[PDB]
Amino acid sequence: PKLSQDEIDDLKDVFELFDFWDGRDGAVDAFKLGDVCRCLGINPRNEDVFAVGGTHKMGEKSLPFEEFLPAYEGLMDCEQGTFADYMEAFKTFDREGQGFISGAELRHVLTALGERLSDEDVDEIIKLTDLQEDLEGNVKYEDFVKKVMAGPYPDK
Amino acid sequence: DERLSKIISMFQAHIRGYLIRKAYKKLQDQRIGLSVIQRNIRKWLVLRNWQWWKLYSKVKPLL
Amino acid sequence: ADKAASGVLTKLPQKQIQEMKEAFSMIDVDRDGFVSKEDIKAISEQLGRAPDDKELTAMLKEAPGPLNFTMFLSIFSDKLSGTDSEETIRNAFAMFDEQETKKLNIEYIKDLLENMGDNFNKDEMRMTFKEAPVEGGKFDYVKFTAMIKGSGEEEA
Ligand SMILES: [Ca+2]
Ligand SMILES: [Mg+2]
């Protein structure tokens, strides 16, 4: 909606990069619509992205810039999780109540529940957040949630 | 339940966001890199088909 | 000029400019200081199949004015200007070789060139790899960059 018209140029810069990456032609594969938006700072769920036109695989539909406008606009309204919800989520997996979840349990929730991530994605986020298990094989989920929420450069 | 499921998915979306945003700088750098490669190879291809370069190249061995 | 010379602020290294001078001398068959359609035809016939008169006339047309060495060097530097250095090209390639193997899988580089960025067409692809240094399914970009920049592997 009330995009800064800066967020429009922002979207233009992102669009151009992705357009370039699947063949510079002024169109971005619809399978990348979600990733474009993610580059603009938002965290849409798969389901949010499909609902605005994102497709399920490469090579199905290609979209021009003007198509990305309403899509990005629509996604900004997408619900984003809060720290409270994340802690409430993980708390359910904390039998002991000491803020720990086993590295295995964490990998399980991330790859088997909700809109499941791949074991490779999990590998990458664990690596990027430099998440470490203690001697018992456990991790402090609060730290992980905070690292994830803060971003790759660490205030996001 | 359905709430827990949604919360978990929102957390995964944060993760998906993190990963793609992390990858952004590398994609920008690589576009520059692929641009350089594509451009200079083409320049080389054009040069190779320029009659003057063909003449110059055949003549070199005699210098 | 006949030995050492520059028309411009062409930025050609003294060593190449010297080569060109000596090529110029051989190209100028009648040894009068200028390159005419006659010199070009003679030296060409001497070295192999000569281009047809039409082509001969069309290359002479590129020199707006007596084709003396100054003019010769002028059309070559204009042709050679505005290209990236060996170092820049090499680093460009290395951006897709994180482990610094100094090579790229042949399918990866072909995929990058044909399906991403400013897509190479089938002819560009064919012309590019007919010359490419490839062995073991590995494209040697360090050798390749050397070749296209002339400090390498095209001939000899
Ligand atoms: Ca494109
Ligand atoms: Mg002459």
Say how many Å lie between the first and final Cα of chain C, rounded: 29
Q: Which residue bears the tokens 């291809």?
A: B45
User: What is the full DSSP assignment across A44-94?
Assistant: --HHHHHHTT--SSSSS-EE-HHHHHHHHHHHHTS----HHHHHHHHHTT-
> Which uninterrupted H or E stretch holds C134?
strand C134-135
Q: After which residues does chain C have a break in its backbone, defined as C to next N over 2.5 Å?
A: none
Q: Which amino acid is at A126?
A: I
Rounded CA separation C12/C96 (Å): 30
Question: Which residues is B2 bridged to in the sheet?
Answer: none
Q: Which residues contact C126 (CB under 8 A, 6 or more apart)?
A: none
For residues A101-124, one letter each, b for 16 or more C-beta atoms within 10 angstroms of the residue's C-beta and e for the rest, the string is bebebbbebbbebbbbbeeebbeb
Q: Which residues contact B25 (CB under 8 A, 6 or more apart)?
A: none
Domain architecture of chain C: domains with CATH: 1-80 (1.10.238.10), 81-149 (1.10.238.10)
Distance A25 CA to ligand 1 centre (A): 5
Say how many Å lie between the first and final Cα of chain A, rounded: 22
Residue B11 has a CB neighbour count (10 Å cut-off) of 27
Q: Which residue bears the tokens 């050397």?
A: C146
- Residue C51 DSSP symbol: P
- Residue B62 DSSP symbol: G
- Residue C136 DSSP symbol: T
Q: Which residues contact A20 (CB under 8 A, 6 or more apart)?
A: B31, B34, C116, C117
State which approach was used to obtain the coordinates.
Answer: X-ray
CB contact under 8 A, C115 and A24: no
Rounded CA separation C24/C18 (Å): 10
Q: Which amino acid is at A138?
A: N
Rounded CA separation B35/A94 (Å): 50
Half-sphere exposure (CA, 13 Å, Cβ side) for C123? 4
Chain A contacts in chain B segment 17-46 (CB below 8 A):
17-22, 24, 27-28, 31, 34
Say what the resolution is, in angstroms: 2.1
CB contact under 8 A, B33 and C93: yes
Tell me if C72 sits within 8 A of C36, measured CB to CB: no
Tell me if A109 sits within 8 A of A126, measured CB to CB: no
Q: How many residues comprise chain B?
A: 63
Q: Which residues contact A5 (CB under 8 A, 6 or more apart)?
A: none
Burial class of residue C76 in the structure, from the number of CB atoms within 10 Å of its CB (0-12 exposed, 13-18 middle, 19+ buried): buried
Tell me if C144 sits within 8 A of C133, measured CB to CB: yes
Q: What are phi and psi of C83, to 5 degrees?
A: -115, 160
Is C117 touching A (CB cutoff 8 A)?
Answer: yes
Domain architecture of chain B: domains with CATH: 1-63 (4.10.270.10)
Q: What are phi and psi of B12, to 5 degrees?
A: -65, -35
Q: What share of chain A is helix, strand, coil (3-state, %, to 5)?
A: 55, 5, 40
Question: Which residues is A140 bridged to in the sheet?
Answer: A100
Is C119 touching A (CB cutoff 8 A)?
Answer: yes
Domain architecture of chain A: domains with CATH: 3-80 (1.10.238.10), 81-152 (1.10.238.10)
Rounded CA separation A133/A141 (Å): 10
Strands A62-63 and A28-29: antiparallel
